Design a protein around this ligand. Structure first.
Ligand SMILES: [Mg+2]
Ligand SMILES: [Mg+2]
Ligand SMILES: [Mg+2]
Ligand SMILES: [Mg+2]
Ligand SMILES: [Mg+2]
Ligand SMILES: [Mg+2]
Ligand SMILES: [Mg+2]
Ligand SMILES: [Mg+2]
Ligand SMILES: [Mg+2]
Ligand SMILES: [Mg+2]
Ligand SMILES: [Mg+2]
Ligand SMILES: [Mg+2]
Ligand SMILES: [Mg+2]
Ligand SMILES: [Mg+2]
Ligand SMILES: [Mg+2]
Ligand SMILES: [Mg+2]
Ligand SMILES: [Mg+2]
Ligand SMILES: [Mg+2]
Ligand SMILES: [Mg+2]
Ligand SMILES: [Mg+2]
Ligand SMILES: [Mg+2]
Ligand SMILES: [Mg+2]
Ligand SMILES: [Mg+2]
Lengths: 100, 208, 127, 99, 83, 152
RNA sequence: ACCUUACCUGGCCUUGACAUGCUGAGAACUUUCCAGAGAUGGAUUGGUGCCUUCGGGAACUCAGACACAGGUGCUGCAUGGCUGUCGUCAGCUCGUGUCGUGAGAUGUUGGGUUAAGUCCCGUAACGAGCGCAACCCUUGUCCUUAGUUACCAGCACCUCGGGUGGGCACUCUAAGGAGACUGCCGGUGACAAACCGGAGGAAGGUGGGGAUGACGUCAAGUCAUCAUGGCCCUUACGGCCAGGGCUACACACGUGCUACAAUGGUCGGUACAAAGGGUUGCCAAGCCGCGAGGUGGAGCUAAUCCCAUAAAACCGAUCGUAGUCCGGAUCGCAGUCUGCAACUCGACUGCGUGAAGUCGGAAUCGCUAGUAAUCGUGAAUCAGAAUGUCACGGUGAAUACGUU
């Protein structure tokens, strides 16, 4: 949770969001059976030459407040522990301690 | 042992959420993040103004913010151009139009957050803690306030061994749930480190 | 005509209708024997009816939802007991002594944190 | 013949809103059938409370969603369409269909 | 193993460095850092120095091990022995 | 416990034979919560007993049980300096459970085709007392008799 | 697996990946190209832009200088906040009064009773506070409100599917409420508190479960979530990139799963649950493949559509106790899915081989009733990756003489 870690993961977010369609095009080309090796190999080369840091598998979502990688709940944008602080303060709407 | 958060365990029973609205998975995280940022920004800017509670109400594509403070003229100054510049500042945190309401609170010395901040700022000016805590308890007890407990922990004075002190008056029943215990925490950044302040105030028994 | 009753036991519910007839006994539009296969459900179901020697005099039409086979049998027993006591309101003490009217209250205890089951715990080596 | 759906985190506000809309719709003469409580949605979270290793110390939290259904017969006056600020105030979502 | 929709897999720089090496015969070992490359049957006879992690270990390729990846023949853990 | 407040829930769920002792034998023989399997096993053993012995299997089971029920047992006691064993008479209720437990435990390890004929053989053996369960009951009894010097 | 990532090898940056103050030049964009494992560098069609006191400004890209920025660097024995533990045990104190030269002690001791410092009466004590109990959630009974996407008693239609008309009967859903408070009876008891049975009652003795953790202890844990007093580096203890490691292996320990079979292994048809997730999503039908899977696209912003068929159970056929129609590790060959990429280092699929394992020493663990045992289902994290975690139901025990 350094400053550099947050900046350089914002880099991944930006690069992935900026293309966001060419990956879909190339994967549609590849996944389609009737595409021919002629139109498959060029798609392979296109995928290879494109920068590696523009993939969903390259993204690790962290806390929007501190950047803690582990303990993430995608329902919120919060880490494991700031969720507790926000809930106790009452900022999270509709959230109460449950017994049942 | 560790005590549960008095405000957390009373949510829904007698306490109320500060951020009251509705959303879904598309923008629940966005709305929550915007609320936390706007609260942080408001406190950081008008920390000088005695602000206690910030409520967020979000109808369709709009946000209505009500601010509780003890010094309304600080924000409503000469017809409140401060209000309009504040609105312009807030317009970017959440894209919806903003609406600001300033609420006055009677008896600022019966409010946990204001009392905690006052004690902390007295401590920052090298005032020894016993007199500050005693006078806070005195002022609170002199008007209603069927109970008050004040705790200060850390490197009290300047000794290089931290410790904890606390004074109570009246009754402060934490295990009961009918009670409405106002609770607040604050910090003081002195030359030797951080000193923490906690305040509990018991106002009455909620019947009905 | 007819009388109605409801029986619940272990997240199983059953609606029972008791009418004049010769005891066709239909369970979810199926015969009683064809529903419970080689178990103790039949006699425990008929226990309140066989205790009042009125096995055939009351045709019984029921529907049962939820739970398991034993739970369904218990629900039917309770429901038909209620339907009967909605017809013969002098045998209340009879089924109190028989112990058929009091509803079961035991339910599956939940799981807790730090435990595997509701009450089982790990081994706790002392070192 | 229109159908109205109401969603809220808290039941008190959804009850107040349902009473308000029922009163507004009945008072104008249009007929209304009674509300239907759709089953609530409960989502639970188990979270660690220690900053470091204490696995058994955990908190359970819950978010509840409440849904109500209303329907009308003989639509003659439509004022609640212009009363959106009345119907929804802070934390109730209203959907309308078959206008 | 990789799905058959993509038989081979070689980095583009490696391809353009070894596709040159087919018109003119094997004359110099190729220093490579890509351990994911799939050796095709039409580069048999060349010496490839694959990155171990400290240095590049050179290996010769014949037809027997064509159906294997590059780094598979370059280990990274020493294990000289417990005793 | 220390309270003596624990209740005694009564279970009597004989499906068709309507026997109380049979129900407790069911509860004893049941394993892993498999009631139906216990029902089939016990009823197969009972039917084998019937097809073998002309006497009705109810009384054969009863007389096997009454010939394996012990009267006294030996129990260890910490005297504070020695390892002593004292004989004590059985509580009237406990002997039934002891007989059931011994019977099922010895029946579980015959090595023949299935527990149907296993329990059949054990019931026939204990009807007059040639089974291993009766032998071990006699061994327990002779422990208790050889330790009669303490008695009390 | 890359990232995560904090370590190693190698290559590359010094106001720097980021913020503020100064000066100067200009759109970011898109240019689809080349050198290199890559950061990076170089050509690079096109438009100079918006508003002007039309002077300039904003914000963007880059360059230069310092004040700096930066650190998952040290100190938890300098700290805040957060957490474990004794322990959910019933204790811990104060004001006034009184006794003692004092440290202190009474209250808080006694006789009962209770889960309880719970209650009664006595009593130099009289009161009070934090604790216990209660107020909160869930489940078990009943009443009213309401009937859509939910239900179907009665009528009808019926292509025999709540399929339709329809109904407000029931179940069900969720809001508001009644009910259990030692309430009544018998016995005991200081005719007190309270104790042992009984009626009614769905539930009887805080009905069952959960949340709630007093004063304090262990210089207990955390500087690596965060914050923070110091101390430390500034061509690096700060940054960027590619590979490797955290998944190594003569051994030892903790926590689980699968077994060692006949209360079972297979084969055929057959029955009944609860809870939940889904519009950068679920992803059905038909069809193609032994299979993992592939085309295809319906419906669903979800009591409606999908995830998705529960299993154990019952019946019928077979195996006959044999390291076996048990057991599945290991291994060989060929596959499927996501991902840029399954060698180090993923999960599943087909064929085949098929191991240890005959219920396990000293020692040791959990559990008092829907409990133990056993069988299945869902969620989170997440491109893929659960024998782990959290949660939900099916079947369903034995035992408690008693306190040495
Ligand atoms: Mg930082
Ligand atoms: Mg990832
Ligand atoms: Mg449950
Ligand atoms: Mg279970
Ligand atoms: Mg051990
Ligand atoms: Mg790396
Ligand atoms: Mg410490
Ligand atoms: Mg600490
Ligand atoms: Mg004195
Ligand atoms: Mg003394
Ligand atoms: Mg003392
Ligand atoms: Mg003393
Ligand atoms: Mg004193
Ligand atoms: Mg005193
Ligand atoms: Mg004491
Ligand atoms: Mg004392
Ligand atoms: Mg008390
Ligand atoms: Mg309590
Ligand atoms: Mg706690
Ligand atoms: Mg320490
Ligand atoms: Mg340490
Ligand atoms: Mg590791
Ligand atoms: Mg217990």
């Amino acid at each position: 949770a350094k400053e550099s870690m947050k900046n350089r993961e914002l880099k991944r977010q930006l690069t992935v969001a900026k293309y966001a369609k060419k990956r879909a095009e190339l994967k549609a080309i590849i996944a389609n059976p009737n595409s021919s090796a002629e139109e498959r190999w060029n798609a392979q080369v296109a995928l290879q030459k494109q920068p590696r840091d523009a993939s969903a598998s390259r993204l690790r979502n962290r806390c929007r407040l501190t950047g803690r990688p582990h303990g993430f709940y995608r329902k919120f944008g919060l880490s494991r522990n700031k969720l507790r602080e926000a809930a106790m303060r009452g900022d999270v709407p509709g959230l109460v301690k449950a017994s049942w | 042992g560790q005590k549960v958060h008095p405000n957390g365990i009373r949510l829904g029973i007698v306490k109320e959420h500060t951020s009251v609205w509705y959303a879904d998975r598309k923008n629940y995280a966005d709305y929550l993040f915007a609320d936390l940022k706007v609260r942080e920004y408001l406190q950081d800017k008008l920390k000088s103004a005695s602000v206690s509670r910030i409520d967020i109400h979000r109808p369709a594509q709009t946000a209505r913010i009500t601010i509780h403070t003890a010094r309304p003229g600080i924000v409503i100054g000469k017809k409140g151009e401060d209000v309009e510049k504040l609105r312009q500042d807030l317009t970017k945190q959440m894209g919806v139009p903003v609406h600001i309401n300033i609420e006055e609170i009677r008896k600022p010395e019966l409010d946990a957050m204001l009392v905690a901040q006052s004690v902390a700022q007295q401590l920052e000016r090298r005032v020894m803690f016993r007199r500050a805590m005693k006078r806070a308890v005195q002022n609170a007890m002199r008007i209603g306030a069927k109970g008050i407990k004040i705790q200060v922990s850390g490197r009290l004075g300047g000794a290089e061994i931290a410790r904890t002190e606390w004074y109570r008056e009246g009754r402060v029943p934490l295990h009961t749930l009918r009670a409405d215990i106002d609770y607040a925490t604050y910090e003081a950044h002195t030359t030797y480190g951080v000193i923490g302040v906690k305040v509990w105030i018991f106002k009455g028994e909620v019947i009905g | 005509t007819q009388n109605y009753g409801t029986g619940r036991r272990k997240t199983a519910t059953a609606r029972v209708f008791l009418r004049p007839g010769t005891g066709k006994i239909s369970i979810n539009n199926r015969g009683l024997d064809q529903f419970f296969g080689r178990e103790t459900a039949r006699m425990v179901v008929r226990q309140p009816l066989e205790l009042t020697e009125t096995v055939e005099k009351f045709d019984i039409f029921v529907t049962v939802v939820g739970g398991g086979v034993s739970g369904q049998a218990g629900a039917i027993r309770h429901g038909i007991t209620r339907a009967l006591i909605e017809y013969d309101e002098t045998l209340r003490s009879s089924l109190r002594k028989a112990g058929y009217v009091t509803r079961d209250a035991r339910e599956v205890e939940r799981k807790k944190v730090g435990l595997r089951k509701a009450r089982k715990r790990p081994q706790y080596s002392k070192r | 013949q229109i159908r109205i759906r109401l969603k809220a985190f808290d039941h008190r506000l959804i009850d107040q809103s349902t009473q308000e809309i029922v009163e507004t719709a009945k008072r104008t003469g249009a007929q209304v059938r009674g509300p239907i409580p759709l089953p609530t949605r409960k989502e639970r979270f188990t979270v660690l409370i220690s900053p470091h290793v204490n696995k058994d110390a955990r908190d359970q939290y819950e978010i509840r969603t409440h849904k109500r259904v209303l329907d009308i017969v003989q639509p003659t006056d439509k004022t609640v369409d212009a009363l959106m600020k009345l119907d929804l105030a802070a934390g109730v979502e209203v959907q309308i269909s078959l206008g | 193993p990789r799905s058959l929709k993509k038989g081979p897999f070689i980095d583009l720089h490696l391809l353009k460095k070894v596709e040159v090496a087919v018109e003119k015969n094997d004359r110099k070992p190729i220093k490579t850092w890509s351990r994911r490359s799939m050796i095709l049957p039409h580069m048999v006879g060349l010496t490839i120095a694959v990155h171990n992690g400290r240095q590049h270990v050179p290996v010769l390729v014949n037809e027997d091990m064509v159906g294997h990846k590059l780094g598979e023949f370059a280990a990274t853990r020493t294990y000289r022995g417990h005793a | 416990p220390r309270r003596r407040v624990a209740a005694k829930r009564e279970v009597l769920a004989d499906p068709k034979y309507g026997s109380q002792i049979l129900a407790k034998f069911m509860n004893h023989v049941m394993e892993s919560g498999k009631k139906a399997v216990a029902e089939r096993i016990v009823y197969g053993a009972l039917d084998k007993v019937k097809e073998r012995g002309k006497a009705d299997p109810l009384e054969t089971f009863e007389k096997a049980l009454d010939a394996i029920a012990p009267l006294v047992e030996v129990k260890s006691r910490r005297v504070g300096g020695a390892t002593y064993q004292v004989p004590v008479e059985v509580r009237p209720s406990r002997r039934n459970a002891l007989a059931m437990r011994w019977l099922v435990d010895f029946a579980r390890k015959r090595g023949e085709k299935s527990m149907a004929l296993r329990l059949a053989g054990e019931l026939l053996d204990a009807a007059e007392g040639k089974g291993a369960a009766v032998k071990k009951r006699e061994d327990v009894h002779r422990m208790a008799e050889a330790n009669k010097a303490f008695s009390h």
